[PDB]
Every structure is written in C-alpha cells, then in structure tokens.
Amino acid sequence: QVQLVESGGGSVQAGGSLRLSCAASGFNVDDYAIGWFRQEREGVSCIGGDGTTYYENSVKGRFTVSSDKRDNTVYLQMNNLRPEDTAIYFCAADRSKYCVGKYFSTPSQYDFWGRGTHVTV
Amino acid sequence: PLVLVFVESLYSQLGQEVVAILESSRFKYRTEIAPTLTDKGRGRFALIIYENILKYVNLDAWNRELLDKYCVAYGVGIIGFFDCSINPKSPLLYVTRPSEVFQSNHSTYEPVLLATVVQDLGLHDGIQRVLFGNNLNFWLHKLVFVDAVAFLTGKRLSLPLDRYILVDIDDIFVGKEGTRMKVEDVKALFDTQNELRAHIPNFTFNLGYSGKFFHTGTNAEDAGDDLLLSYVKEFWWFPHMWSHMQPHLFHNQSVLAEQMALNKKFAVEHGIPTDMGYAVAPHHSGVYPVHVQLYEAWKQVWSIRVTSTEEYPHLKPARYRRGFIHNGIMVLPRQTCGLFTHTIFYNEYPGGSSELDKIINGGELFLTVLLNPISIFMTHLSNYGNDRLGLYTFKHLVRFLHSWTNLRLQTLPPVQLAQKYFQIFSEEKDPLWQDPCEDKRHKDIWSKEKTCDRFPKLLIIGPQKTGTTALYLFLGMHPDLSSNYPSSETFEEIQFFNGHNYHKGIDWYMEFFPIPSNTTSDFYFEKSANYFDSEVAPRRAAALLPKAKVLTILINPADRAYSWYQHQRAHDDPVALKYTFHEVISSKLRALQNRCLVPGWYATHIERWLSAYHANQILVLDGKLLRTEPAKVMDMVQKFLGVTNTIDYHKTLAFDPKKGFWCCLGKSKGRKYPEMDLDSRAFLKDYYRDHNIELSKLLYKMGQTLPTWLREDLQN
Ligand SMILES: Nc1ncnc2c1ncn2[C@@H]1O[C@H](COP(=O)(O)O)[C@@H](OP(=O)(O)O)[C@H]1O
Ligand SMILES: [Ca+2]
C-alpha cells in the first residue's frame, strides 16, 4: 500500500524557515518523484530519484528540497519565506522519478498524493 | 482539417483540456490568442473552438464580419465555453448512448445535455454553434465534447463506433506468499471472463506468466493455481519473461533468448498456446529507446509482431503515447488502467477506494476507451488474488461503457488490434526518434553499455553544387571541431533524417560519431546536402537534435541550377546529357527539372528548417565569397559556432590559381563547363525573380546579411 504522510506548519510571520517532512510509508521514496504542490495545485518543487532538483522562479533562490533514504522521507527545507507561500503543500508521488521542467508543475503528471499540511505565513 | 483554438490564456487550464482531447483524438490544432482565415480559395480552419466564448461576443466588428463570412461560405462551426441527463432525440449523439445554464423558449437550439451542453441550430445565422456551460472536468462533458467535434465537421473529425479493448494481466506467477491466487480467485476469474465474454465478444484475458516463480510459493497456492493448468483453453497468454527481469540489463541477445526459451518450455509444459504474436517487457525496458536485441529476440523465439509500451515518445502525458512500426514489430501505446502492484486490497488503494471508483466511472479508463480506438490495459496479479481488483475494475468498466456509450466494444487478438491501429493512424507507422539521454527514465530504459552524447552539434545542410564540401573540409581543419566518419558509398553524407535510413534507428546513427572523451573533440558535425529540399529531414532532425546548429550556404540560383545540371552532366546521367538546358528549364525529364529547380527555391526550404530550428541556430553565407575571400567568412563561422579557440584562417588558407579556388577535392569540385546561353539565362533570370524577392525578404527577416548576387539581382 502506497501512503504519503506529511507534516510541518506555522512560520515566523514576517519570514522564517521550516523543514516539511513527507514520510513515504509502504514504498521507497528514492524511486518516485515526490514533487511538492502548493494550492489549483502548483508544482513549486520536484526532487528526482538520482537527486536532480527543479524549482519555479518564485522559489528558485529560496526553497531547498532534499531527500533522505534512511527514514525514507523527503524534506523541504524552506527559507526566506514570503507571505504568498501560504497554502496546502502536497507531496505527490509519480512513477517517473525524474522530473522534467515542462511537467513538474502539472498535477496531471503526479498519480498518488498525500493528505496535505498547512503553512501559515 | 485544421482546427483553430482560441485560448483565453496560454496557461489557462481549459485550453489544456480542449487541446488534450484534440491531441488524444489526433486532431491537428492551431494555437492562437485573440488572423487570416483562408488560404487561396480553400478554408484554413475546419472548426473553431473559443475557450472563452465572450471573445467572440465582444469581437472586433470587421473581424466578426470576416469570421461569420468565412463560416457561412465554408460551413465552419464554433464551439463555445462559459442533474445531467442525456437527450435521446439529439442529433449530437453519435458515440453517447441515452441511459441513467442554457434556456431558450424559442426552438432554436438542441438541449443535448439537460440539467448543460447544448447545440444551437444552424439556421439562425448560417453558422452552427455548440455551447458549453461548465468546463471539461466531468466525463459526460468530455463525451459530449467528442460528440460536438464529431457532428460539427460532418463526421470528418470523428472516429468509428468500433472500439477495441485489450486487457493484459501482467505479473502472473511472480508474487510472494500472500499475493498469489488460490482456487477461489481462479474460479472467479473464469466466471468473470464468462460474463465479460457475454458483454464484449471474444473478451479473453491475456496473462503475463513468469515460469520460474511458479511452483515456488505456497503449495496450497500452487494447488490453488493448479486449476489454471486445467483452464488453459479459455485464456489467452503472453510471455512476461522467466524471472521478471528487465531486458536492457541483459545487454546480450543470446541470454535473453535463453530466458525467453525457458518461458517457452514453461508454456509447452503448461499447455499454453505458443501463438498470438504479443509480449510485453517487465518495466517496458528496451521498447523505447530501442534495444535492438529485445526486438530481435522477441521475433526469433516467439514470433512477436505486436508489443505494447508506455515509454514512447515519453512516459507522461499518456495522451502523447503513439505507436510505431520499427524492426518488424508494430508497437502500440499502453495504458495505465489505475491498477498497480502495490494494490492488493480494495481498502488499501491510494486515496481510498473512491479514487478507484472515479478511475472506473469516468477516469483514465473511460476517456482512454473514448479517445483511443485501441486501448491496451495493464493489470497485475495482485489485482486478482485477494480482493480481486481487476475483476472489479473490468466488471464495472464494461458495465459503465455499455451503459453510457453505444460503442461496438470488441476484443480482437492483438495482431488484428495492431493492424486496426495502423489502419486508423497511418501517420504513426514512421517512428520519431528522440534523445535517450534527455529523459532520464529513458536512460534507465537505455542500456548502460551505450555511451551517451554521440550526436552532432551542427548540421551543414545544403543545397548541392554550392560549396558545402569545401566548408566541410575547412570546418574539419579546426582542432575543436570533429567531422563525421564517411558513411560507405554516400561518404560524408549520412542521409539519415531525409531517407529510408531513419528506419534503421538511433544506434545506426550513433555509430558514425565515436565515444566522447578527453582525447576526442566534443563538437561534432555532418554535411547533409539532401536535407535542404527534403520535407521530412528538418522535423526529424529537430526531434533527435534539438540544440544542433544549421549551416546553409546559398549561391546564385540560376548558376546553382546550372551547376546542378552540369553535375548530372558530369555524372553521365542519360536524360541530362540527352536534352539541353533550355529544354530542361518523359518522367526522368520532369524529375531532373524538379530536382534542378526546387532546390533553387531557397525560401521554401529555409521556411521548413526555420519552422524546425531556431533562427539563432540558422546562419546563411554568400558562397561566392567562399571562392573569393574565404577567411573572413570562416571567421564568421567560427563566431557562429561559439568555439573558444580561434584559428587564424588568413594564414592557413592559401589561394591556388591552378585550381581557381582557395584550398579542395580536385576534379569533382573543379569542373570547367561552357557558360550558360543567353536565352537560357534570360529564362532563368526571369523565372528566378519572385523566389529571389521572397528570399531577400526572408534573409532580411532572419537577421542575416544579404549576399552579393541577391543584391545585383534585386537592383537589376
Ligand atoms: N573552395 C572551394 N573548393 C572547391 N569547390 C568550391 C570551392 N568554393 C566553391 N566551390 C564550388 O563548389 C561546387 C560544388 O558545391 P558542393 O560542395 O555542393 O559539391 C563546385 O561547382 P563545380 O563542381 O561545378 O565546379 C565549385 O565551383
Ligand atoms: Ca511487471
């Protein structure tokens, strides 16, 4: 059974940092795309199975997505946090682990999704 | 039958949905925001969709007059875009079957979907309108959108009602203990195939067996699957390898043939028919990009004519998945079906069981059957063993399909399916090759012995008899640049993208350019003279080499046609020797005149290469300057290619008055013929006037300096 459980919330209200942890229970997190989608759903980040990393232009100098094989959890080390960033962040799985720049922002690219957690900035 | 789409924004989601259904239906669209409607007495657009219909209502009045005039003179319909029940008497219904916003009291419209989607009558203003309340999220709205495109073009933009479903049960006899079936699941599988044979004629399940991991699990499960040894006549079977191992990991044809022969021995001892020409690789490894040894070993010991993959041309989106007939095997697109190996229960589905119930009742399954004529579905053994998920999804799918569609759902054997697929889509018989290194999923599918980046970065396109091989030699003099190896009889021409050499494949093209290393030069090129006038060469060249550079040289087209005529005169071709040049400007005379004069039309070929490649990658020189002062033009090429080191071409290019050209290839590029006759020069100066005028406007459009001969022909 493929399940994605996410966590992390709040912020320093003028701008701060967080590490949203998306735990991949029941499957391996290094085999799927685990791209983060903020609310319709916008794919601001994606972390490939070889570790290749893509961003949007709003988040390019700010966000730092990462992966850890040991707890099977993809982390989103956020930084320099704008008030536009507040949303529901969805870590979504895809069979193609490697991200492509035309389609890492598309929610139709990503098959299995998560519950979603809220950041308030 | 081009169809003009008018999107509200380039990133609007309804434009992506309408363009998504059009690309799934293989309907040739035209993206435009907020133009010329005719092309010399023939209509340029067969159908119009406004993704925002309020663009049409608030249109410019003169442009609205031209739009309504083009609609009434050519019969063009407009599709608009601002519980649900189906009208049984509606003329829109062709695919939709009547089973289980917009209000007008005057009868000038047909309420096709009743609460939504209506069909306004053609007699109000001479044009036909189909109007949409909501967007294309609900599956019934996409169904009536397919019916809307179907009727408004007079069934030109439609598909036949015969629809084809192939169901593959992958991963048979591969699982661990707790995932395999027992007697109850095999008996329910046979009973389900009885009811689905009652629904779809000749619906027989196709089973992807693995013979090694059979008789290794639970003996109760092995006796549970021993009843499938009594059930062989009522099931179709396809080979899915002995140990479920990816075919590119073998990277040897022979040991893959031993694995497939072990599955063949398993098929003989089970009673499995060694037939049907169909097999599928486990992770679709080796189908796209083409591992040659998988395609060879498939047809050697199994007579495979049909395979099915999801890798071509990319994995996602599934709307783009085409088929291709390469290496004697007619590949088809595979569909996901929503069922995966991790799903063994109804409860443990991703997003709950309700997400599966959206996928069945109007998800990827239903729009896959509606938008594709041939639909090959992938299911696994874990969807048949505990809660029997594939039995559930197809017992509910064909009930949903025979409820809501009047499609003729028939399951043919996959050879007949592949023949029907390439009868309906004859344009997909040619594969369109792409870079294996560009998509890393394809590189995982690609074998690890194959070296990455063995492709050119510059394409020296023609045309012939201009000076291209001297430019090839002078680009070969540079240490940072490496020329291609000679391709046997065709020499420095590979003629890959324009001829029948495109069907040989990527690995045939990769053999001319060696392995990149520190010793070998990174920048690679080929001189490709027949690719100028060819129509198929630039689109395939932009498909395989997106970042390559295009280098053309152009001389005087009267003198180019004269030198081409003297080129076939010097090659002892009999028709060109038989008739003089005045008679040139039988079928061989027309073919000689066509390949003598349509290469002279520079603008019509640079339009194709500029439609493929960017104009920064395209650069045009004078060609006569290659005979007069070649060092400045070679300095311009060295500035064009973006190289770091620069060769002083003033000192190493030495003029030879014995040859007449700066050095060379001797006799073949040093031919001396009598000069063109005055009546022939008058005819060829009169005919090459308008082609020179659009050529001069094109070279001013491209940001290119105009040549000398173009300026004297424009002045005189
Ligand atoms: N530096 C050079 N060396 C050799 N041929 C050259 C040249 N510059 C121009 N040419 C011309 O290149 C023509 C052939 O062009 P291409 O490269 O497409 O085969 C020749 O026409 P001829 O073969 O009639 O003498 C020759 O006139
Ligand atoms: Ca499999």
Numbering used by the authors:
A (entry chain C): 1 to 39, 44 to 125
B (entry chain A): 83 to 116, 123 to 170, 197 to 214, 227 to 241, 265 to 734, 741 to 818, 828 to 880
Task: Give excerpts from the publication.
Bifunctional N-deacetylase-N-sulfotransferase (NDST) enzymes are the first to act on nascent heparosan after its polymerization, converting GlcNAc sugars to GlcNS, via deacetylated glucosamine (GlcN) intermediates. NDST1 is a Golgi lumen resident type-II transmembrane protein, which contains a single pass N-terminal helix that anchors the catalytic luminal portions of the enzyme to the Golgi membrane. We have carried out a detailed structural and functional characterization of NDST1, the dominant human NDST isoform, revealing a 3-domain architecture consisting of a non-catalytic NTD, in addition to catalytic deacetylase and sulfotransferase domains. A distinctive feature of the NDST1 protein architecture is the opposing orientation of its catalytic deacetylase and sulfotransferase domains, which effectively precludes a simple substrate transfer mechanism for bifunctionality.
NDST1 inhibition was observed in the presence of nAb5 and nAb7, suggesting that these nAbs bind regions relevant for catalysis. Initial reconstructions of NDST1-nAb7 showed substantial disorder, consistent with unresolved heterogeneity, which was revealed by 3D variability analysis to correspond to a hinging motion around the NDST1 elbow. Further local refinements were thus carried out, focussed around either side of the hinge, yielding 2.42 Å partial maps (Au-FSC = 0.143) that were combined for model building purposes. The resulting composite map was of sufficient quality to model both NDST1 and nAb7 in detail, including the amino acid sidechains present at their interface. Examination of the NDST1-nAb7 complex revealed nAb binding at the NDST1 deacetylase domain, across its substrate cleft, providing a clear steric rationale for inhibition. nAb7 binding was predominantly mediated through its CDR3 loop, with H-bonds between D593NDST1–Y102nAb7, K465NDST1–Q113nAb7, R590NDST1–R99nAb7, K589NDST1–Y58nAb7 and salt bridges between D593NDST1–K101nAb7, E459NDST1–R99nAb7, K465NDST1–D99nAb7 and K465NDST1–D115nAb7. The overall structure of NDST1 complexed to nAb7 was similar to that of free NDST1, except for a slightly more closed conformation of the NDST1 elbow, consistent with conformational flexibility around its hinge. We also observed improved ordering of the D319–V332, C486–G512 and T528–L538 helical loops, likely due to interactions with the proximal nAb7. Conversely, NDST1-nAb7 displayed a ~3x reduced kcat/KM compared to NDST1 alone (0.06 min−1 mg−1 mL vs 0.18 min−1 mg−1 mL), primarily driven by increased KM, consistent with competitive inhibition of the deacetylase domain. We thus reassessed NDST1-K5 binding in the presence of 10 µM nAb7 or nAb13 (≫10x KD for both nAbs), which bind to different epitopes of the NDST1 deacetylase domain, with nAb7 also binding in a mode that occludes the polysaccharide substrate.
